[PDB]
Amino acid sequence: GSVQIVYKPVDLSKVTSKCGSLGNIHHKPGGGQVEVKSEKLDFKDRVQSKIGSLDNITHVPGGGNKKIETHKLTF
Amino acid sequence: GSVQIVYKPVDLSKVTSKCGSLGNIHHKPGGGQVEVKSEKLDFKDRVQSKIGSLDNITHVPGGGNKKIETHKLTF
Amino acid sequence: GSVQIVYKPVDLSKVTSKCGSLGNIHHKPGGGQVEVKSEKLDFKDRVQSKIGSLDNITHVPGGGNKKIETHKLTF
Amino acid sequence: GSVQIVYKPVDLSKVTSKCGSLGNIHHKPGGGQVEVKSEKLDFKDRVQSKIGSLDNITHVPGGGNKKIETHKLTF
Amino acid sequence: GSVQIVYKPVDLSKVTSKCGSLGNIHHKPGGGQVEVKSEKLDFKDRVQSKIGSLDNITHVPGGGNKKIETHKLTF
Amino acid sequence: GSVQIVYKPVDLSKVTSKCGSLGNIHHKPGGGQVEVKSEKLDFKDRVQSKIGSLDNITHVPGGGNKKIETHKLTF
Amino acid sequence: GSVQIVYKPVDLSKVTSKCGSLGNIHHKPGGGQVEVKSEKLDFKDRVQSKIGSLDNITHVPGGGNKKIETHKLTF
Amino acid sequence: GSVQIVYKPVDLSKVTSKCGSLGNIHHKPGGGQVEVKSEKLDFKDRVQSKIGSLDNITHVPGGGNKKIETHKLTF
Amino acid sequence: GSVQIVYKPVDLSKVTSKCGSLGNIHHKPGGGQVEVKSEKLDFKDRVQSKIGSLDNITHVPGGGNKKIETHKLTF
Amino acid sequence: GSVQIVYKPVDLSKVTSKCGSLGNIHHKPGGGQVEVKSEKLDFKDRVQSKIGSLDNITHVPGGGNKKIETHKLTF
Amino acid sequence: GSVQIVYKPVDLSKVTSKCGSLGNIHHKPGGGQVEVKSEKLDFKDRVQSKIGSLDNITHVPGGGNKKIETHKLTF
Amino acid sequence: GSVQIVYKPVDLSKVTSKCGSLGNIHHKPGGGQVEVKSEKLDFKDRVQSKIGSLDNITHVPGGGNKKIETHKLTF
């Protein structure tokens, strides 16, 4: 028989932020030492890997708002 | 027989933040030391891995609001 | 029989941010030492890998808002 | 009248060490964080000072034997 | 009247060391962070000072034996 | 009256070392971060000062034996 | 609803002085001595300050009458 | 509704002085001595300051007869 | 909505002074000594300062009558 | 009859002082006030006079030894 | 009859001082005030006079030793 | 009869001073005020006079030693 599919997501949305001031932010890691030694590693699909990282991150987005959507239809 | 599917999510929404001031934030890890040694690792699908990480993070978004949605239809 | 598919996402959305001032941000790593030694690595598909990283990152986007969408229809 | 002083230490002495191997010694300081805050330093005689030092020492003498002697005569 | 002094120390002494091997010695400082804050420094006699040092030392003498002697006569 | 001084130290003394091999010695400082802040310095007599040093030393003498003597006679 | 404010202060007043003579006034300060010692001054807001002053004042107004008035209305 | 503000201060006032003579006024400071010692001064906002003054002053107004009035209305 | 504001200060005021004579005023400072000593003078906003002044002043205004008024309306 | 007078005083004397060091002296008079009121000052023979003085004296002689003698003969 | 006078005073005398150092001496008068009032002065023989002085003296003689003598014979 | 007078004073005397160093002497009068008021000043013989002085004196003689003598004979 006849198959009728209607997919219509409707969105009216606002992700909003107001900040009078961002500042006077201090992040103070002292340099550093790292060592990695390896024989066999076997990564086969979508593998995300961090080994021996010594990461310092400072992230001050004035907004930093995120909107994420996934729309999927399968037949 | 005939199949009729209607998918219509309707969204009217606001994610909001108001701040007079963000500031005077201090973060103080001592530098650092890391060692990793490996023989055999076997990651086969979507594996997310951190080994021996020494990560310092400072994250001060003025907003930082998140809106996340998933819409999925399957036949 | 006849198959009719209608896919029509409708979106009116705003990711917005107002900041009066971004400033006086200090991030203070002093260099460093890194060593990596390897024999066999076997990365086969979509593998993302970081080994022995010593990353200092400073990121101050005036906005930094993100809107991400994925739309998929499969038959 | 007569004063006679005779002084005579006689020393036969041996300070000895034997070691088969001085090795596989690891000194791996994990970093550190130090802060000092002051009004005045006002150092007027024979002051020895360290302020905010973060000093690492590794000392592996193959012998490291010490012999110390003092002879003093006063009249 | 007569004063006679005889001062005659006699020394036979040996400071000795035997080592089969000095090695495989690692000194690997993980960095570090130091801060010092002051108004005045006012150093007026024989002051020895270190301010804010971050000093690494590796000292592996094959012998490193020490002999110290002092002889003093005062009249 | 007569003053007679006779001063005769006699020394046969040996500071001696054997090492079969010096080697495979690693000195690997992971950097570092130092800050010093002041208004005035006022150093007036015999002052020894180090400010903000970041000093790495490696010292591997094949002998490194020391013998020190002082002889003083005062009238 | 309707709001009516009527503010009507009425002032009929006299500040009066009669003097047969203002005079034969002697101010003869006998000199003086003042000493002040300090490390730092750190003035951050609205200070009215006098430090170590030795100030002589003679003030002889013939009338010197003072009238001070304030009228304030807020809505 | 209708807002009506009427502000009508009425002032008839006299500050009056009668003096038969202003005079024969002597101000004769016997000198003086002042000393001030400091290291740093850090004035950041609206400071009115006098340091180490030896200020003499004579003020003989014939009237000297001040009237001060504000009138403020705010909406 | 409908507003009215009416402001009508009516002032008939007089500062009056009668003096038979202004005179025979002597200001005779016997000198003086001032010393002021400092390292740094950081003045950052609206600062009024006097340092080490030896200031003599004389005033003999014939009237010196003062009338000060301020009229302020804000909406 | 015949008169014989012999006047022969003999003086052998020493006025001595030994000082290692003279110093660190402050004389800081706090000002002062004097008034003296008189009619007639008839001074007729050998008068030494001070009237209404305000005198300050500082006297630090390295020796300051005084020897005074008087020898008088009358017939 | 015959008059014989012998007047023969004999002096061998020493006024002595030894000083290692004179110094660091301070005199700081705080001004002062003096008034003197008289009708008549009538000084008739050998008068020494001071009237109304305000005198400051600093006197630091490296010796300042004094030897004073009078030798008088009258007939 | 015959008059024989012999006046023969014999003097061998020394005023001595030894100083290793003269220095660092400070004299700083803060002014002062003097007034003197008189009608008639009749001074008739050997008068020494000071009226209304305001004198500052600094005297640092390297020796400043004084030897004073008076020798008088009358018949």
Tell me the three state secondary structure of residue J69: strand
How close is the nearest chain J Cα to the Cα of L72, in Å? 10
Task: Enumerate residues 6+ apart whose C-beta is below 8 A from I35.
Answer: H34, H35, H36, H52, I52
Task: Write out chain B residues lying below 8 Å of A43, CB-based.
Answer: 41, 43, 47
Q: Judging by beta carbons within 10 Å of its beta carbon (0-12, 13-18, 19+), is residue G4 exposed, middle or buried?
A: exposed
Out of L1, L19, L53, the one facing K55 most closely (by C-beta) is L53
Chains E and D touch each other (3 or more Cβ pairs < 8 A):
yes
State the chains in contact with K (3 or more Cβ–Cβ pairs under 8 Å): G, H, I, J, L
HEC string for H11-74 = EEEEEEEEECCEEEEEECCCCCEEEEECCEEEECCCCEEEECCCCEEEECCCCCCCEEEECCEE
Number of neighbouring beta carbons within 10 Å of residue L20: 13
Any chains having at least 3 CB pairs less than 8 A from chain B are A, C, D, E, F
Residue E67 burial (CB count, 10 A):
23
The C-alpha of A68 sits at a distance from chain C's nearest C-alpha, in angstroms, of: 5
- Chain A residue nearest residue D32, CA to CA: A30
Interchain CB distance below 8 Å, K13 and J18: no
Residues 12-51 on A with a CB inside 8 Å of B are 12-51
Chains F and A touch (3+ CB pairs under 8 A): yes
Nearest-neighbour CA in chain G from K31: distance (Å): 5
Helix (H, G, I), strand (E, B) or coil at B29: coil
Number of H–I residue contacts, CB under 8 Å: 288
Tell me if I17 and G54 make a contact (CB, 8 A cut-off).
no
> Rounded to an integer, what distance in angstroms lies between the CA atom of residue I53 and that of residue I36?
9
| Minimal-distance CA residue of chain A relative to D33 | A30
Which amino acid does the sequence have at B19? C
Which member of G6, G44, G51 has the closest CB to residue H44?
A: G44
Measured between its terminal Cα atoms, the distance across chain G in Å is 15
Q: Does G55 touch chain E (CB under 8 A)?
A: no
Separation in Å, CA of H21 to nearest CA in chain G: 5
The answer to whether the Cβ–Cβ distance between E28 and A33 falls below 8 Å is yes
The helices-and-strands tally (H runs, E runs) of chain C is: 0, 7
Nearest residue on chain C to E35, judged by CA atoms? Answer: C28
Q: Is J35 helix (H, G, I), strand (E, B) or coil?
A: strand
Q: What residue in E sits closest to A27 (Cα-Cα)?
A: E33
Cβ contacts of C72 within 8 Å, gap of 6 or more: A71, A72, A73
- Looking at the DSSP bridge assignments, the partners of residue I33 are H33
* Residue A40 exposed, middle or buried by CB count within 10 Å (0-12, 13-18, 19+): middle
Pairing status of strand A66-74 against strand C66-74: parallel
Helix (H, G, I), strand (E, B), or coil: what is residue F67? strand
Count of CB contacts below 8 A, G vs K?
14
Q: Among G28, G31, G33, select the one facing L32 at the smallest CB separation.
A: G31
Cβ–Cβ under 8 Å, residues K66 and L15: yes
Write the CB contacts of L38 (distance below 8 Å, at least 6 apart in sequence). Answer: K37, K38, K39, K40, K41, L51
Quoted resolution (Å): 3.3
Between chain F and chain J, are at least 3 CB pairs below 8 A?
Answer: no
Quick one: how many helices (H) and strands (E) in chain B? 0, 7
Tell me, yes or no, whether chains E and K touch by having 3 or more C-beta pairs under 8 A: no
Q: Which chains touch A (3 or more CB pairs under 8 A)?
A: B, C, D, E, F
Which residues 6+ apart lie within 8 Å of C60 measured at CB? A58, A59, A60, A61, A62, C22, C25
Report the gap between the CA of F39 and the closest CA in chain H (Å). Answer: 8
Give Rg (Cα) of chain J.
Answer: 23
Exposed, middle or buried by CB within 10 Å (0-12, 13-18, 19+), for K59? middle
| Å between A30 CA and nearest CA of chain F | 5
Q: Measuring CA to CA, how many Å separate E2 from each of A64, D1, D2, G8? A: 98, 7, 5, 119
What letter would DSSP give residue H8?
-
DSSP states along B33-57: EEEEEEEEEEE-SS-EEEES---EE
Q: Which of G61, B44, E49 is nearest to D43 (CA)?
A: E49
The experimental method behind these coordinates is cryo-EM
Amino acid identity, position E55: D
- Cα D27 to Cα E27, E31, F3, F58: the distances in Å are 5, 13, 60, 14
Distance (Å) of CA H32 to CA H28, L9, L27: 12, 54, 14
Q: How far is CA L44 from CA H27, J44, K52, L3, in A?
A: 38, 10, 21, 39
Between chains, do E63 and F19 touch, taking CB under 8 Å as contact? yes
The Cα K9–Cα K69 span in angstroms is 11
Q: Are E60 and F24 in contact (CB under 8 A)?
A: no
K69: its two tokens: 């003598």
Residue F20 identity: G
Contact by Cβ (8 Å): C25, A58: yes
